[PDB]
Structure 1
Amino acid sequence: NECQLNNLNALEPDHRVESEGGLIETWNSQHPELQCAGVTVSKRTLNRNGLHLPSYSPYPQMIIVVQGKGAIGFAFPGCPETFEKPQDSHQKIRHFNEGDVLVIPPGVPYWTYNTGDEPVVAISLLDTSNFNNQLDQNPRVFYLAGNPDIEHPETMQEGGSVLSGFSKHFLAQSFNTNEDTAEKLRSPDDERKQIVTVEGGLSVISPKWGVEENICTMKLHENIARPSRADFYNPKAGRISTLNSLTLPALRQFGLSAQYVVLYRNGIYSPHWNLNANSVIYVTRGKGRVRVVNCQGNAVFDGELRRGQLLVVPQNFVVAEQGGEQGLEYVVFKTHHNAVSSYIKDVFRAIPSEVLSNSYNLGQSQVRQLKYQGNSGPLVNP
């Protein structure tokens, strides 16, 4: 019964956590649309010099940066620290800017920092139903530092880092340190919350600013937005770009992929469905008309989606979008490492003339212009 949805809604963030250095806004995971899709979303904003403290979660996250630029560090287990300075050593620092997609592995700690003047804004698809999460479907975030406010409040009906749950004496014995250091490790009077502000700026070792050439240095980010990455293009209607496991191989293990589409003013992304994955659309710019149809032939969504709105398009449901006067830009997260979609102009080319005539009571003259007259692709300029 989870996906027997009679109506679908254009959802915006329910909860908000203001922090010293930024802001986290979450969608409620209990919305029926998001339960069908088996995911929840989170919008994070890091202000200038904002440092999102190190954390991890038991499921993968696919994040698209829609504004600003910064650095992300992951702490891979037992991998060497290949960045060193004759003194501090640490692992590889990766740089991102807008249009990039980042992928966080299950259980791997990560931290991000805002490198520019403007605030970094990023929306994250928390894939809680992924086969790699062996707990349950509730969103969870384990923090290694600070005293964080609850990000997904609905999982309950301020908290602590995983280090505050241990005593300063066992932490002193455990990390061979003095009890004064051990005491600060459990963040006793920290009110900054999970995204702090680094005064003066942060300085880490980086060119742009053991060995292991294999797993310890795996690519975990790729740009999806830049115009030249288009896989489909019609200069009068728009462009589509696909990011999947053939581009970013780690996605084969996390089960996610994504598309970035851009529709020009009045451009149609004609009737289509995803064959093997649920999708989650997040509009990054503009507005336009979207119509989703289920198996009974009923439109379960029929209206305008606009910037800041989220819309779930379940597997096999037929979608169709059209950019408005300002055009429409959005990212589509899909829950498959290699999600494939299909569009109806293409299904008509593939079917014999006569089963098309007999199916829609069309003449050969009409089947022939359906089949060969366009605008072969999915992007239509009307």
Structure 2
Amino acid sequence: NECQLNNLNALEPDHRVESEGGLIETWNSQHPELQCAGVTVSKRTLNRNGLHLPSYSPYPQMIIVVQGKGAIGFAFPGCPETFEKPQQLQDSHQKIRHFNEGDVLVIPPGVPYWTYNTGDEPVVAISLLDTSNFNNQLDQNPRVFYLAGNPDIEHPETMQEGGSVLSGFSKHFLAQSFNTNEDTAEKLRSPDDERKQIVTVEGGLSVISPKWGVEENICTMKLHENIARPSRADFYNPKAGRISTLNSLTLPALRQFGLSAQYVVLYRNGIYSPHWNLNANSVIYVTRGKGRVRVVNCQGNAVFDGELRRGQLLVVPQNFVVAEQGGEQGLEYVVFKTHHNAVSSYIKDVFRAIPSEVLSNSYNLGQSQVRQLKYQGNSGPLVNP
């Protein structure tokens, strides 16, 4: 009965991990709303020259960059290092991908990744940790395997200290394994490192990049897409707002990760009429502004009815009906959905699909009243009252 919730709360971060080069804030995965959704969320901040040390988790992550710009690099197993710099190579590594605010990034399960702030302002990103994803064969707990550094626990609720996976091996064995000296091997264990999982790169970081076979396809799996730019809108009403969808039809990698998302922008008083998601739980994170949100369950009860503003997280269970109205300054938010091609339906459109007399007898309405419901007013889900 994990989703038999009579109340839904707007949630904010519960735990904080302050590092040399940044901050990591996590929502406790044990909140009943998040347990129903089968996910948890993590907000990461990379300060100037901030470098998030390489790590991987046993489930996919969908991240939206809400501030700043940087680069992310993955370590795909067995793939060639297509970025090379001659000194005889002086260095070579895999493709460096750049991201900006409004972009969504996807981290594959088990694939190592690192990120770096390439701008002046701090990078702020919100990550949906899809812990319940079918690909996670461990358990519901969020887990982060660091390949470097001496991290602090990011999800403390699961401990009921941190260390890299390399610190679990002796320097002697690492020395032999990696055909290196024990001095190098000891450093690989981060024995005296006190910077934690996000460090500051003094002097700035330098990597091979134009801007700063298997290689053509798989090894270059597209893992980022802008979702917030106005021009990418899929639904639009100049006087109400816009809705943009990012799913497996845009980012094919999502098909195997069971995740998709939408970015919604509602202008002052703009309304996103009553709608529901047919095949997925959803998690709203407000990126800006404020608005009135209402979520109704199968008993016609509003499990949530209140203001929702920047920084808050609100779970909308599969099939529950939700509606939003932009406040004074409008409202913007991303909605993570636990399906690679999540589909929703809005009630206005439903009325149009049902025969006039079915509607009349259902709501005891007159022919003219029904007609006005099915044919009058703007057609889309975005309404300017």
- Counterparts of 1:346 and 1:381, CA distance in 2: 16
8 A Cα contact 1:81 1:210, kept in partner: no
- Counterparts of 2:38 and 2:165, CA distance in 1: 26
Aligned equivalent of 1:54: 54
Q: What displacement does 1:159 show?
A: 1.2
Q: What displacement does 1:224 show?
A: 0.3
8 A Cα contact 1:80 1:210, kept in partner: no
Structure 2 residue 304 is matched with structure 1 residue 268:
no
- Counterparts of 2:227 and 2:117, CA distance in 1: 20
- Counterparts of 1:210 and 1:333, CA distance in 2: 34
- Counterparts of 2:252 and 2:191, CA distance in 1: 41
8 A Cα contact 1:12 1:27, kept in partner: yes
- Counterparts of 2:246 and 2:126, CA distance in 1: 16
- Counterparts of 1:94 and 1:253, CA distance in 2: 21
8 A Cα contact 1:288 1:323, kept in partner: yes
- Counterparts of 1:101 and 1:261, CA distance in 2: 14
Structure 2 residue 306 is matched with structure 1 residue 313:
no
Q: What displacement does 1:50 show?
A: 0.3
User: SS where residue 222 of structure 1 aligns?
Assistant: strand
- Counterparts of 2:15 and 2:68, CA distance in 1: 23
| 1:31-86 per-position Cα deviation (integer Å, ceiling 9, x unaligned) | 00000000000000000000000000000000000000000000000000000000
User: SS where residue 366 of structure 1 aligns?
Assistant: helix
Aligned equivalent of 1:277: 280
Which of 165, 179, 190 is equivalent to 1:187? 190
- Counterparts of 1:279 and 1:129, CA distance in 2: 13
- Counterparts of 1:381 and 1:90, CA distance in 2: 51
8 A Cα contact 1:256 1:338, kept in partner: yes
Structure 2 residue 363 is matched with structure 1 residue 357:
no
Q: What displacement does 1:119 show?
A: 0.1
- Counterparts of 1:234 and 1:193, CA distance in 2: 46
Which of 141, 148, 151 is equivalent to 1:148? 151
- Counterparts of 2:162 and 2:322, CA distance in 1: 41
- Counterparts of 1:209 and 1:305, CA distance in 2: 38
User: SS where residue 102 of structure 1 aligns?
Assistant: strand
Instruction: Report the CA distance shift for 1:37/1:211 in structure 2 as closer, same or farther (over 3 A).
Output: closer
Aligned equivalent of 2:141: 138
8 A Cα contact 1:284 1:308, kept in partner: yes
| 1:161-214 per-position Cα deviation (integer Å, ceiling 9, x unaligned) | 000111010001100001100110000100000000000000000001276201
Structure 1: unaligned runs, 5 residues or longer? none
| 1:295-354 per-position Cα deviation (integer Å, ceiling 9, x unaligned) | 000000000000000000000000000000100000000000000000001000000000
User: SS where residue 345 of structure 1 aligns?
Assistant: helix
- Counterparts of 2:307 and 2:200, CA distance in 1: 37
- Counterparts of 1:289 and 1:212, CA distance in 2: 48
- Counterparts of 1:247 and 1:157, CA distance in 2: 40
Q: What displacement does 1:101 show?
A: 0.2
8 A Cα contact 1:147 1:158, kept in partner: no
- Counterparts of 2:296 and 2:114, CA distance in 1: 40
8 A Cα contact 1:283 1:306, kept in partner: yes
Instruction: Report the CA distance shift for 1:106/1:211 in structure 2 as closer, same or farther (over 3 A).
Output: closer
- Counterparts of 2:374 and 2:29, CA distance in 1: 43
Following TM superposition, where does structure 1 have runs of at least 4 consecutive aligned residues deviating by more than 6 angstroms? none
- Counterparts of 1:5 and 1:253, CA distance in 2: 29
- Counterparts of 1:157 and 1:174, CA distance in 2: 34
Aligned equivalent of 1:19: 19
| 1:136-178 per-position Cα deviation (integer Å, ceiling 9, x unaligned) | 0000000000100000000001311000111010001100001
Q: How many residues get paired?
A: 382
User: SS where residue 369 of structure 1 aligns?
Assistant: helix
TM-score by length of 1: 1.00
User: SS where residue 200 of structure 1 aligns?
Assistant: coil
TM-score by length of 2: 0.99
- Counterparts of 1:36 and 1:57, CA distance in 2: 21
- Counterparts of 1:145 and 1:242, CA distance in 2: 35
- Counterparts of 1:371 and 1:299, CA distance in 2: 25
- Counterparts of 2:165 and 2:328, CA distance in 1: 49
| 1:227-248 per-position Cα deviation (integer Å, ceiling 9, x unaligned) | 0000000000000000000000
What's the C-alpha RMSD, in Å, of the aligned pairs?
0.6
Q: What displacement does 1:374 show?
A: 1.2
Instruction: Report the CA distance shift for 1:316/1:210 in structure 2 as closer, same or farther (over 3 A).
Output: closer
8 A Cα contact 1:82 1:210, kept in partner: no
- Counterparts of 1:326 and 1:196, CA distance in 2: 36
Percent identity (aligned): 100
User: SS where residue 147 of structure 1 aligns?
Assistant: coil
- Counterparts of 1:36 and 1:330, CA distance in 2: 21
8 A Cα contact 1:82 1:211, kept in partner: no
8 A Cα contact 1:81 1:89, kept in partner: yes
- Counterparts of 1:128 and 1:120, CA distance in 2: 24
